[PDB]
Design a protein around this ligand. Sequence first.
Ligand SMILES: [Mg+2]
Ligand SMILES: [Zn+2]
Ligand SMILES: [Zn+2]
Lengths: 50, 98, 79, 1358, 49
Amino acid sequence: DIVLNPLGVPSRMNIGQILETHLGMAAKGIGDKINAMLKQQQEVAKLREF
Amino acid sequence: HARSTGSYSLVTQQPLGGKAQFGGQRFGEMEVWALEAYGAAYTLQEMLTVKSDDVNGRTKMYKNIVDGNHQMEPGMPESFNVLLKEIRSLGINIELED
Amino acid sequence: ARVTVQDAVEKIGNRFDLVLVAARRARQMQVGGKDPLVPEENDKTTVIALREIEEGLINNQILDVRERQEQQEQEAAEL
Amino acid sequence: EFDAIKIALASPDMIRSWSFGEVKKPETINYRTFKPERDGLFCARIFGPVKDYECLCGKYKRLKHRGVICEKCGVEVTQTKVRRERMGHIELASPTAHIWFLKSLPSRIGLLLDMPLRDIERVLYFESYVVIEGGMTNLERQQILTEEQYLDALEEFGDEFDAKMGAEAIQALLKSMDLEQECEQLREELNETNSETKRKKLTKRIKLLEAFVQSGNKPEWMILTVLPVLPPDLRPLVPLDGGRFATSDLNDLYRRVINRNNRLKRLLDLAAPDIIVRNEKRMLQEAVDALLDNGRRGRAITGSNKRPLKSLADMIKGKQGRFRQNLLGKRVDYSGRSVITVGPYLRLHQCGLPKKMALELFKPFIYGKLELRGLATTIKAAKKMVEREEAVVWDILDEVIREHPVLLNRAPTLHRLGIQAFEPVLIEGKAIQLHPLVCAAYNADFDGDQMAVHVPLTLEAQLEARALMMSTNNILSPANGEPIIVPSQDVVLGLYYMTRDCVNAKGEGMVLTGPKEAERLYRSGLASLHARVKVRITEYEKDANGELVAKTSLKDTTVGRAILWMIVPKGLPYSIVNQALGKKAISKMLNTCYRILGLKPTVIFADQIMYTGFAYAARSGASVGIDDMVIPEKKHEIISEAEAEVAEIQEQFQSGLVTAGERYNKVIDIWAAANDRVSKAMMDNLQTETVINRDGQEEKQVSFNSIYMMADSGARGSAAQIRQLAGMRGLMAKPDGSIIETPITANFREGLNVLQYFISTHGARKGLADTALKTANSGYLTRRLVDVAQDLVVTEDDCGTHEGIMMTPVIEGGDVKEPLRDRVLGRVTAEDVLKPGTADILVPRNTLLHEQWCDLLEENSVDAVKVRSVVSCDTDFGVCAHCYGRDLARGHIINKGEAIGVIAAQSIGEPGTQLTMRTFHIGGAASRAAAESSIQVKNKGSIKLSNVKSVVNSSGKLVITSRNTELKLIDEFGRTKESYKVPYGAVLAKGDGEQVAGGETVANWDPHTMPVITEVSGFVRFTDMIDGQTITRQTDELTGLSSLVVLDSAERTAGGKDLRPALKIVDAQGNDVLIPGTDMPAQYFLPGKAIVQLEDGVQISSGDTLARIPQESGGTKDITGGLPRVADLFEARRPKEPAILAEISGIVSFGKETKGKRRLVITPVDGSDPYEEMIPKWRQLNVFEGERVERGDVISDGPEAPHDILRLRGVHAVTRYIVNEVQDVYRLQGVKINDKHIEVIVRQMLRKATIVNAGSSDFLEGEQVEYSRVKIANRELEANGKVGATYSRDLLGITKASLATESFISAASFQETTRVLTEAAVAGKRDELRGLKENVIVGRLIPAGTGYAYHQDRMRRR
Amino acid sequence: RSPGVFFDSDKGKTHSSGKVLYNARIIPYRGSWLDFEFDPKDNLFVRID
RNA sequence: GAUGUGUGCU
DNA sequence: TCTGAATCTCTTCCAGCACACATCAGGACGC
DNA sequence: GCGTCCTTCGGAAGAGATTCAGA
Ligand SMILES: [Mg+2]
Ligand SMILES: [Zn+2]
Ligand SMILES: [Zn+2]
């Protein structure tokens, strides 16, 4: 959805954006796993475990 | 924002300031230095007379531009007449010499 | 049909007299009915004046002598 | 039309001549039907009719009655625009003092009547009397009497003897004063007196009197009798919503003045008691003084909410006056404003105007073309058609905009490249696209900033925009010969990723048959971009006389370099892309391409470089993750070791071995040691620690770590940022200057504690505030520089002089700071240089040293040349082209008629502003140097010392015992290759005459704790030092050893001020020891903050540390703190402790001892000997009674004053000193400025010359008159047989050198408008509209560029 | 600044010789000020407003 | 039109 | 006790452009 | 509502006015 510029990270040391990027990628991965396990009808056991 | 020939101020016949009213961007004191550095005298002369304080030259330039003719006949900025009157309002006497 | 004018500056070497010469020529080509000596390519008068400068057949001396021979022809045309 | 402007005082007759009526009622518009009152401030009878061509009563309505005057109300009918060109006047009841000529410092009335300002003000505000025409009494014409003394005068001298008060008394004094008799009496007094202070006072008064007599002015005109009023339309009362009116201030002040004047006139006829009418006259005087210049008195009057309203002077002076707000800079039609975006598809000469903005900008052109094509009929129809935005107005807009350039200007226009001209390209949107290359020149990022687009209207403006201001003609920075359109931060990364090799490939050993085949191979996915191949290439070369001869070979390169070579123009050697192209490499590539091929191939090359950088940067995906910032593994180990050392030192502190001094110093130093070890481990693990397989075994290479890639390429980042990301952050100090004991050991790859972040916030906030509230001074410096040098233009071609300054490479402590090539490129030489085949010339006398000749001198290893300089030029009112040098924006001589004085001022003034608005880009790091302590000679060669005084020590080695010692290394060839500036107290390993091998010291010293090391041995007795009064003594009771600390001028006792702490040396018999060869006793003064660990009456050696002094040399040394130095040099402030020089050469001696301070007399061997100077007893005089001193030799030590250098060592020495100091300040920050600009500013500083003797000329004796007039007068007189006038060049700072110019308009528009206009009006000065600011103000063509020809024709027509 | 008394320093640049003065400002919540301060000649000068 | 506040890019 | 040198006091200066909003204009008294 | 009217708080530098001290 958006293509930023890498060179804006090292000169102005706001490394928090890259860590937020990685953490948001992990969060969206968890959300995608939940959405995949919820799209095909699966019982509450697998969802609760995950 | 952009501004062609529009509305002008009252005390000095300059274009208004701002986007709310139809106003033109200020050609500041630093930009005049940059125009002098290039040596562009005609550009500077049009910048401070014919699209600015001058009244008769401004209308003549407008007619020339919508006449097919790119030519300016500037007079004197009205902000200089304002300065002369404001100095003469004191005890000083400043005037032009033939 | 014009990007930079370095060669035209080489033709008349002041870079300030070039502006005045091109202004005189372009004003003659715009207000006056005078015709360009090079084939115009849907360009403005200033670009054509600069290009005629770079073609070599125009300068301040040439403009003055052309204007003066036109003036003497005009004076003789009164009869 | 006209050619000059004259300014003088206004007589009441002239004021009545200006006026058309006399306002006598304080009635504005009547809060009713918007009609002027009968005789009010707005009056149709006096100024003019309100509506156009309509009489106020309404008896006439059309032009058919123009010129006639009505009968019922008597308002003449004409255009309504005469309401802003016709003034009135107020007949004041009593005379009133003009505040400008009362409080201008000096008060003109004050030194014209020879009275103090207090007495004249007391008279002028009705609190004392003054005596005019005392007569047969003992009261003088200038004596001041109070109320009771006037009562005594009336009872004791109740004759016709008169003594008035108020403004009328001063008017009578001025009117009844003769000027010629007073002037000749002052001449007699000056010629008969002998002192200097009264001489200055009398010459000031006689200057004022001669100015008054010469002009047509009158002293009695300073007191107002008629007060003119501003025209109504220049102080408009605009009606708003409601019955009220605008909060006008001039109208309110006029209301107050007219009310008070009418009240005074009423009371004059009512025969009111003298006290009441006196008070009312005082109130009228105060009101008039408030109208003229409000706030010049004690308290200013205010209209509402205690806001001081603006008087007439308040709208002529200041930043919001008619000069700096409406004349020097104006709001401008055909202008636009919007946000900018990139759009890298453009070319170097194009920008993107929004389609809905160019319709508004080029609107009259659209009207004209529509009327030409017949689609419209009148202006109204075309206007309606355009605002309706039909289907054909876009097809007409594409014709008015085809080749009509526009000017894109960013808001802070620091240097002249901030305004450039682009050919527009219409786009759909609302953002002005801007070519990515020119962002460096504009300093325009794309994070929300806007640019202003202007439309050149006339034909000449378009031709100037295309020929001068087009971006394709601005590829060279006017500040220095470096290119300004350099790839920045993405093209650099693209060309660095493309032109780089790793030891492996998709296909490595394959051999290619051309760059085209290399591109075909890469795009097909058959070989990686970083292969190591042997491609066959054809590199052209123009080594002949402009002929391109090709040579094909087979070079070992990469695929990426072969691809990039395809866009390089024919004419460049191939050893320009066959490397790892960073940013300096690309800049040098563009510079060489511009110097070799020209301008058009350079523009084409820049566009192709940008395209192929963007493409192959996108095809690389050079991201940045969190694994790229690799923290070195040996980081917490270093932290543990350093913390163990810190704990050991902390424990030792409690043992008493180390105090809270050296312990703090060593703990800071060991933390810094750990910092550099961690950073070195990080930067050794980051780049070379990348094991890759050769396909036979492993080996190392340069890393592809993306952080290191964009740090090495020079795209964005530096060593500091990578150190703060992967290593440790550093030592963030406190705002006061105390470095924090525990530096931040965490970086922005791990976290930061709740406390380390708060520590960093101090530095971050100071770095953010420094920009915001300290770019003002750096932007005021450039304004002063522009205003002092606005009137400099190249008005000749060759002044024809053999003079000039000497240029040599600058080496004062390290390697080559700037080689000769940088310091001499593009500057015309003055004398034939000689190779080491001397008496054989190498260059002609007046040849421009361009690039070829400038490397033709490095081949011959030339060390010094004499080149023509701006400061030493000879032409009048200008600078000849040859005396200037290269244009620095084009590769040739500067063309005649160019305003170099502004190109110099902007170039000097915006490394400062740019680097102070960018301070917080690096954060808040100190960036302090290492404060080195050893001198290691780099090359092998002879050693030579100049003006160094060294002594013998216990070990027999020479030790520095001078303050201005200079160590220089000279190689075996015979040239200076290295120099060193060692401090006082430096020990030496080798001396003079013998060569020193490389890798050993020649000079060692301790930077801290400078000593007072002696030269002769003997016992010590403390002279003029007693405990408590001048020194504080502390003694340990165990060992009983004394320890004393000296005091400064602060805590020194009032009775102890005359006490001078020092040290004297005595022998065993108590006699005074002597230095060998001299008779000066060993009286070594002890400066402040000195710590002495020695005892009284002990034996010492010769050359031992007598005392130790802290140096307190701690500072960031950024361009924020580090640029009052530039302003100090330019304004030329005398330093706090100036170094005393010698005024005259000859034999030196000493005169009257202890005349308050020591005295020294210099007696020439042959000439007269009147010179004696009283040297203060502070510092040691380096000259004794056995040497001969030449003028310019330093009697004392310390910083030089940039007036003594000019007076004694000449003009070349002072201009070289200023250039060297300013250039050192700038080079400390890494910014580059060519010295021509600083020399130009120096020349503009040197324009006032003081006359010594008039000779045969017409100049005065001590007058400070402009240098050009003196020079032309001397050239005219010496052409005949008469003798000239001897002068003396004076140095004025850029503020005073601008205030004291010939044209009063420039000084009035620059600074101190009141003090300049008052002096010009008193002196009756006559402007000439000579420079550039005057013509800008008036509204004419400047005599600078394309208008220089017009101004030359105008001058030659008369 | 809270009403009360603040003994400032005016350190450094005053007197152009290095002698640091001392001042004692008495700021009330409402009313006039009572600035006490020293002199380079060791004299106490009251300064009302 | 002038003040007062807030904000953007240097 | 005349007169340079030091000191005290008053004035001038402190960036460039732009945008948004609000408030103001005599308010105190006579009718 | 219409309408006629009489705080203090920076700092740096420079000029120009006063005072010191000293021969
Ligand atoms: Mg920005
Ligand atoms: Zn009438
Ligand atoms: Zn010259």
